[PDB]
Ligand binder design. Structure first.
Ligand SMILES: O=C(O)C(=O)Cc1ccccc1
Ligand SMILES: O=C(O)C(=O)Cc1ccccc1
Lengths: 326, 326
């Protein structure tokens, strides 16, 4: 009858804690009696407790500015019995805090994890603060005393007796981390019985593929399979297999559920070629902004030709030579 | 007549400082009068000074455990006039240090950047140390006083009056970061005149490609071009174009120089399709370990069939259903 435990990277107040709160909200219907959010010291302990069946884990997956959390990716790849079934986002915003009762004019020190101080340079500038490092942004907000300002997640203001003096004060606008919720596979299959039965098309999957061949053409031959099946991808990365340099796996995120016939037929083809395959996550399809190509702002330099009216002798232009280095 | 300046992420003692030392050695023949290694506060300042023509920059590129340094990747993508021309590695090993004259039995505190303490857990355990955070591992070794042990790069022992008591004491064996050396493009083209003239095949390139089309098949059609040209890839990642979600660029690392005819003909084809393209780096080809496929150790679970003798009704095996979630 107990609350479903949701294990996240501690301590209390981290962005991963916020992710757990968000997850508990979106997943409320799966666990009517609610969730018990439990901080853990690290990610391997989270996976272990999830895989033992004590509850669900939530782990940072991808940030749009910093990329994948590669150790988490690698750990999920090699888990014996976990799969992702929800993907939740947390905007990376830092608030500024003082110890309750402390006067902000008297703060001379900014405290946060060094990566947090790096994201709040302007604020530190504008307030003439020195910097002191903390083990985490959250620990900084926990340990606040007068004469300091801590930078941390919005959630810290809920958890500790601290006074918010600044909201979303970080330099960069628009960074966000996505997190996956993880559970043993049989449990998830059951949770997915209805959409699987309804052949619901509104799902995304994350898949790892290892063609057991090397050399030119291996990835092209693989991806032709997804093309010919009409499967759209939204993220792709190559990784070594278990840190071994010179080995190659591929992790794809696609706009399909593995029960869809086109997906099924792709995987049959890939598996019958001998490639190793594993589905790492299946979760409801997020709605992607689709800014049109004609509105895409391209990076500086580079070569771009008008495909319907090509320039003459374009291959020898000095600027082309520079950008392509040929 | 001066030393060539080499700008790296400060302060003195960082792994990036070690990378600069390594770079100065491998590149000694380009600058007979030697190098002046200059620490800078951040990467954008490094790129700026490189692009202004004050000297060369060196920036962290990819770590095998943590992946690409995505902000560095993105910054190079958008530079107006920089290209990489050397790729140097630094093994991630931490040494343990005490203030000169201090007795190691009396150390009660370990100091490092939190990511450094996280990589040296066992040592901290085995020595009954509490932990204190520092802004960087290097800063920890700089600021050493008795009763502390700092964890930092080998180079710290050269730069500060500190006594090494432990060598490569970190938990994980075998992590390494590669760094790129950057310079304006005309300068690099000149540096590459000989191998370009000799049509030297012993180079690798990093390339960013942006097909100006969306939907299924876009990447497959692109990569078919590299297949048909016999170009082998060793790394691949998708990225948003300038943080914009729903836009897509691709960054490939390949075993060819852009002057090679097969490479040239690939890029002609890609450019005449309308895709935007930019070469981010060209540098001597590193020798890749090529462990044979039959020796590849695969991750736990997953589906792998014997391609020459397939199992019967394999698509309905309970274990298959679990690993693929269909
Ligand atoms: O080819 C497709 O499926 C596309 O949508 C392009 C793509 C491919 C892989 C990652 C991101 C975008
Ligand atoms: O298809 C090839 O070129 C391969 O070598 C496989 C591959 C592709 C992309 C990144 C790493 C390996």
């Amino acid at each position: 009858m107990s609350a479903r435990k949701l294990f996240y990277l501690g301590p209390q107040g981290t962005f991963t804690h916020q992710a757990a709160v968000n997850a508990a909200q979106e997943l409320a219907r799966f666990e009517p009696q609610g969730f018990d959010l439990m901080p853990m010291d690290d990610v391997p302990q989270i996976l272990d407790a999830a895989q033992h069946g004590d509850g669900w884990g939530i782990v940072a997956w991808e940030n749009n500015v910093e990329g994948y959390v590669v150790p988490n990716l690698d750990a999920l790849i090699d888990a014996k019995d976990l799969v992702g079934f929800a993907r939740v986002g947390v905007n990376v915003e830092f608030d500024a805090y003082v110890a309750q009762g402390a006067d902000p004019a008297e703060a001379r020190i900014a405290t946060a994890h060094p990566h947090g101080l790096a994201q709040c340079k302007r604020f530190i500038a504008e307030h003439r603060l020195s910097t002191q490092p903390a083990t985490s942004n959250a620990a900084a907000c926990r340990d606040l005393i007068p004469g300091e300002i801590a930078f941390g997640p919005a959630i810290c203001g809920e958890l500790y007796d601290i006074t918010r003096i600044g909201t979303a004060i970080q330099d960069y606008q628009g960074a966000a981390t996505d997190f996956l919720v993880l559970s043993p596979r049989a449990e998830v299959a059951r949770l997915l019985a209805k959409p699987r039965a309804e052949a619901n098309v509104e799902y995304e999957s994350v898949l790892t593929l290892i063609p057991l061949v090397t050399g030119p053409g291996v990835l092209a031959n693989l991806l032709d399979v997804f093309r010919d099946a009409g499967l759209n991808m939204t993220s792709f990365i190559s990784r070594p297999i278990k840190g071994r340099t010179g080995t190659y796996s591929f992790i794809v995120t696609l706009d399909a559920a593995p029960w869809e016939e086109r997906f099924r037929d792709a995987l049959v083809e890939i598996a019958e070629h001998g490639d190793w395959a594993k589905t790492l996550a299946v979760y409801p399809r997020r709605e992607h902004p689709n800014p049109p190509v004609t509105s895409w702002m391209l990076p500086q330099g580079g070569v771009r030709l008008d495909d319907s009216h090509l320039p003459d002798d374009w291959q020898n232009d000095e600027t082309v030579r520079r950008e392509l280095m040929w």
